Design a protein around this ligand. Structure first.
Ligand SMILES: [Mg+2]
Ligand SMILES: [Mg+2]
Lengths: 202, 128, 70, 169, 150, 76
RNA sequence: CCGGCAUCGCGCUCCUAGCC
């Protein structure tokens, strides 16, 4: 035998420190923490991270026109991720500061009507979250164990505060999107390396 | 400080308004069970269970998401088969749906069965 | 299940937290039935050893006195 | 059937030295055969009242016996209680809280399952108006009575008319 | 909450589901009856007796072992006290407080507490007369209250 | 709903939240409708999806994530 | 919607009292 795709994702996410949470736990994020160490930091159920990653992927793939998806990151560690995620899946990346009124102000030049919205962290990307609730836009977010879950539909539980975790999660979302779209055929051969997604510090 | 069938129904309104699927009523009685039977037979709740550890009792109710408000008329007035009409105008949202629960010597039952069986009694509550 | 952490009376079916235990001293290996939250200084009838101590919670056994929940 | 089980009960005192000082002492009121699901049958016995602690004292090495001195089908043992109809609108007759439907059916519950000890109950009210009395037995004494559970429900449907299912924690 | 304070504690005992005595309790109803009467004749009220049988002789609850409440056991053998236990103890505390009060007449906190205890005594005595556990003529004297107890 | 002569006289029977059964009104702009796709075999996607609606109440409590998680666990 | 029974429905001499 070999390792199943679920096992390999578990290995990689465990290598990228995705399993390693924070000291606190939001109660709505409590359905995803497995246990807490003497350090005080929680450990995330990676099997439930993978299950939510599947659910998110099946929601993303059903979008008939991928240009109707907006991906976004206010943090500096998630720029290079959300760009390549947008470039291999065909969605629209916006990295950095979000302009208030992008989703609710029709006369703005920066004005979009996204059918879906993906967020690195509910804490720092709270402006697009609030603007979503005014435009009937479902939202997928990467939620640490201290992430507020107001106005987020699909939450992937993970450490979103590390350099390798953000990259590996976005790489791994992209992989499933391509698999279900059929551009990656059955057989794990996909040639884009996870090192493309970690950001580069000049 | 207790007069149950108010705590039960108000716990149910609060739980239903928060969208919970299970509600727990600590002190039970035959009156509460008889009321909940009318609720179920008219379709506003799912099935429910009595948990007897020993004591007054305990029950858990399964909420179907279709009840809007269920309350008690404490100070249970005396209610004859002719002034049913005016209570249901004062207390129900329309002539088409909603029920007033009355305790009668023929059991606990809703006002419509009371009209058919031609019996009055004392009002316990309502739900709609 | 997490009921074991809940209060004694707030469980789905109420239950006590105390137990009766079979206790054994050293100088007289008979077995005495004693209650986890004693409230009394108790001495075994044979050896006359002081056996447990009343506290605010569960009774404090004395040195080297084995017990079994039962 | 009353008399064939009367005969089966009447002479076990021969042999089985260890059963003496038990069955020289006790007539049964009645015993009836009743059908459990699957064309299997079973039997119920009614000790009157005064000797229920006697039967419950042993209730194992003789209940096996009536599956070897009868060896066709199951038997169960209960004690006959009188149920009184509720006193009329006030008649100055108090009806002690025993011989009340609730207490009597709780006794038949406690004795039909006698080997085990009852540890919990639940009363489920199905949507259309069916009612189920689920009972949790002690998890010990489990390979003694797990196959008469369908029998136990069949027994309870007869003399109390209730739908009880059994289970363990 | 508490009748005469704002405390709202819920600390109390929780009896088990199981009505029957435990498997390991082997003592017979007559021996327990004998222990209860022996401690009673020595002067122990039903609460102290229950504490004794819990602690020394491994009786969880008499009503589970013997089937009868300990007060009923004491009544059947003609040994229940004439003044019920809780009223006895309230009377004794009121007497103690009053005895303290004649030595400290400016201690107004104890005067307040004396009022509270006599209030509790009157309420419990009302109950006892209503339910025929006291003569319908029993009434509580501040003066001749130490003669009754202790 | 229905006229007594059989006719249907309401216009636009509203959607109902799939978690709480509340009505999703015309002006409730915090509600969303999710279409999650069905993977079957080679290719792992055709235009087959199941749809779930969430009203602004649930989404504003935060319980949208738990409710969606529990509603996706239905097997067919 | 309800009468009339039967389950493990404290009695009748006397008024009404079905063909036991
Ligand atoms: Mg309180
Ligand atoms: Mg007060």
């Amino acid at each position: 035998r070999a390792l199943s795709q679920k096992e390999q994702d578990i290995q990689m996410m465990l290598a990228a420190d995705v399993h390693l949470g924070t000291k606190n736990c939001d109660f709505q994020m409590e359905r995803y923490a497995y246990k807490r160490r003497s350090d005080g930091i929680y450990i995330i159920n990676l099997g439930k991270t993978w299950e939510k990653l599947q659910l998110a992927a099946r929601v993303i793939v059903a979008i008939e026109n991928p240009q109707d998806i907006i991906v976004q990151s206010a943090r500096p560690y998630g720029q290079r991720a959300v760009l390549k995620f947008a470039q291999h899946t065909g969605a629209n990346a916006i990295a950095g500061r979000h302009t208030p009124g992008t989703f609710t102000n029709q006369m703005q030049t920066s004005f979009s009507e996204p059918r879906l919205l993906i967020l690195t962290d509910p804490r720092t990307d709270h402006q697009p979250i609030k603007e979503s609730a005014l435009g009937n836009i479902p939202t997928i977010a990467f939620c640490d164990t201290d992430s507020p879950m107001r106005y987020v539909d699909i939450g992937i539980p993970a450490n979103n505060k590390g350099r390798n975790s953000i990259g590996c999660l976005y790489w791994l979302l992209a992989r499933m999107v391509l698999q279900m779209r059929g551009t990656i055929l059955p057989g794990h051969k996909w040639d884009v390396m996870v090192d493309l997604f970690f950001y580069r510090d000049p | 400080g207790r007069r149950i069938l108010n705590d039960a129904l108000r716990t149910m309104v609060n739980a239903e308004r928060r969208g919970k699927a299970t509600a727990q009523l600590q002190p039970i009685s035959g009156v509460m069970i008889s009321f909940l039977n009318i609720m179920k037979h008219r379709g506003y709740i799912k099935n429910f269970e009595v948990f007897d550890p020993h004591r007054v009792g305990k029950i858990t109710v399964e909420l179907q998401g279709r009840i809007k408000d269920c309350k008690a008329l404490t100070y249970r007035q005396d209610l004859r088969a002719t002034e049913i009409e005016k209570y249901r105008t004062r207390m129900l949202p329309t002539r088409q749906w909603g029920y007033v629960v009355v305790t009668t010597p023929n059991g606990v039952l809703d006002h419509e069965e009371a009209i058919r069986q031609n019996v009055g009694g004392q009002v316990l509550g309502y739900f709609h | 299940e997490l009921e074991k952490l809940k209060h004694k009376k707030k469980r789905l079916v109420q239950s006590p937290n105390s137990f009766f235990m079979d206790v054994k001293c050293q100088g007289c290996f008979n077995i005495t039935t004693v209650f986890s939250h004693s409230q009394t200084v108790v001495v075994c009838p044979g050896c006359q050893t002081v056996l447990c101590q009343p506290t605010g919670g569960k009774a404090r056994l004395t040195e080297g006195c084995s017990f079994r929940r039962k | 059937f009353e008399d064939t089980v009367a005969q089966a009960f009447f002479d076990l005192e021969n042999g089985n030295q260890e059963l003496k000082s038990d069955l020289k002492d006790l007539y049964i009121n009645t015993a009836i055969q009743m059908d459990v699901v699957g064309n299997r049958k079973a039997v119920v016995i009614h000790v009157p009242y005064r000797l229920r602690k006697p039967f419950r004292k042993i209730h194992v090495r003789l209940v096996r016996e009536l599956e070897k001195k009868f060896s066709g089908k199951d038997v169960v043992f209960v004690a006959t209680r009188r149920i009184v109809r509720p006193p009329k609108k006030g008649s100055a007759v108090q009806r002690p809280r025993t011989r009340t439907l609730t207490a009597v059916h709780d006794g038949i519950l406690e004795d039909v399952v006698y080997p085990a000890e009852i540890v919990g109950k639940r009363v489920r009210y199905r949507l259309d108006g069916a009612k189920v009395i689920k009972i949790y037995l002690d998890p010990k004494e489990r390979n003694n009575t797990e196959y008469k559970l369908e029998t136990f429900s069949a027994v309870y449907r007869r003399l109390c008319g209730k739908d009880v299912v059994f289970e363990y924690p | 909450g508490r009748m005469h304070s704002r405390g709202k504690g819920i600390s109390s005992s929780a009896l088990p589901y199981k009505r029957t005595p435990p498997s390991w309790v082997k003592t017979a109803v007559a021996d327990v009856d004998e222990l209860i009467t022996k401690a009673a004749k020595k002067g122990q009220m039903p609460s102290q007796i229950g504490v004794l049988l819990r602690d020394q002789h491994g009786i969880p609850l008499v009503k589970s072992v013997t089937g009868s409440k300990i007060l009923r056991i004491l009544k059947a053998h003609g040994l229940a006290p004439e003044i019920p236990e809780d009223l006895y103890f309230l009377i004794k505390k009121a007497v103690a407080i009053r005895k303290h009060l004649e030595r400290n007449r400016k201690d107004k906190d104890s005067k307040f507490r004396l009022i509270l205890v006599e209030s509790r005594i009157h309420r419990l005595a009302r109950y006892y007369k209503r339910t025929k556990k006291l003569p319908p003529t029993w009434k509580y004297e501040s003066a001749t209250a130490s003669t009754l107890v202790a | 709903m229905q006229n007594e002569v059989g006719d249907m006289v309401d216009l636009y029977v509203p959607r109902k939240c799939s978690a709480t059964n509340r009505i999703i009104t015309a002006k409730d702009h915090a509600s969303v409708q999710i279409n999650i796709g069905h993977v079957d075999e080679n290719g792992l996607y055709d235009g087959r999806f199941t749809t779930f609606a969430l009203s602004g109440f649930v989404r504003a409590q935060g319980d949208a994530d738990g409710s969606l998680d529990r509603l996706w666990q239905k097997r067919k």
